């Protein structure tokens, strides 16, 4: 419905293990009660949900692949278990539910490159 802006880095490298952590900051209209954050994979011109979490108070964000906690405007995200096939464009989608109204923010994408040893 109503929209807000989501910023995230364009390119992120993995570690040898498969650690790809980035920051997803959203231009919040204000301080919200329920915020649902979602990570989306555009690897093959197709969308696949990866993370999915929601918190109904201040900074109590607790997510499987995704380890990460939220700090106000910025959610600190980490993705484990990345193979070279996991390479793709990851979109951080932020939904703030309550209080009304509904604000939706779609990030341009974080291209994560993963190789394997």
């Amino acid at each position, epitope marked *: 419905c109503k929209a807000m*802006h989501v910023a995230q880095p364009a390119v992120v490298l993995a570690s040898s293990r498969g650690i790809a952590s980035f920051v997803c*900051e959203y231009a919040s*209209p*204000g*301080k919200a009660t329920e915020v649902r954050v979602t990570v989306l994979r555009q690897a093959d011109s197709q969308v696949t949900e990866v993370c999915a979490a929601t918190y109904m108070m201040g900074n109590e964000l607790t997510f499987s692949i995704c380890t990460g906690t939220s700090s106000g*405007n910025q959610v600190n995200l980490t993705i484990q278990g990345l193979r070279a096939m996991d390479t793709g464009l990851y979109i951080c989608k932020v939904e703030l539910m309550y*209080p*009304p109204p509904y604000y939706l923010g779609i990030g341009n994408g974080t291209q994560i490159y993963v190789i394997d040893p």
Partner: antibody
Amino acid sequence: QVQLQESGPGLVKPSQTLSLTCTVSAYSITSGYYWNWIRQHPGKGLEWIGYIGYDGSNNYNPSLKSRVTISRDTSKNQFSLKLSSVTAADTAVYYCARDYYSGYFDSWGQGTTLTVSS
Amino acid sequence: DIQMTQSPSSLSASVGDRVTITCRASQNVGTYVAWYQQKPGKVPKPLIYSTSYRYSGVPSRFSGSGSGTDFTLTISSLQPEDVATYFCHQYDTYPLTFGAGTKLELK
């Protein structure tokens, strides 16, 4: 687009009850946002009086909790301020502004000017 | 409450300069700070929200900076239309508090 228009008396004698109405158009109070009242003293900063939400919920500044009542008329799309036992310290320019829950003031009314004089 | 101390109280500047207005929060508020432009005899107009994002329609010369307790509003290239009074504002903890205001003079 969302428009807010203040309305009220020019002057208020001391110890009266102050009444202003903020007529909102192009958006409905009951849908979702928090609707605030703000005054600005001559020569000082901006003071936040309080709000009323879509939910009917109220919160007022602890400085002005006892002297302030903010009420709304759902049919007319208005939310009004009631400030009682006024003093000369209440001479200010009064604004009504839209807000998200603890957020930036998305829209403002033109603001109305009120003088506490005898 | 939470006190937002705004500096400078009033400044003088010529067109083309770069002016910075500071607003020091007595307590940490994170990124929940906004900047508003009140023109002389006019309505306040929101410029900066979330401490770094321009309101829809704000020219690019306006930029918001700051982290934690210190916040700055920056005009890259000053213009005649920008002569106004600028206010900072928190939205992390009720009650909401503004700054004392900073006034712009054309030198």
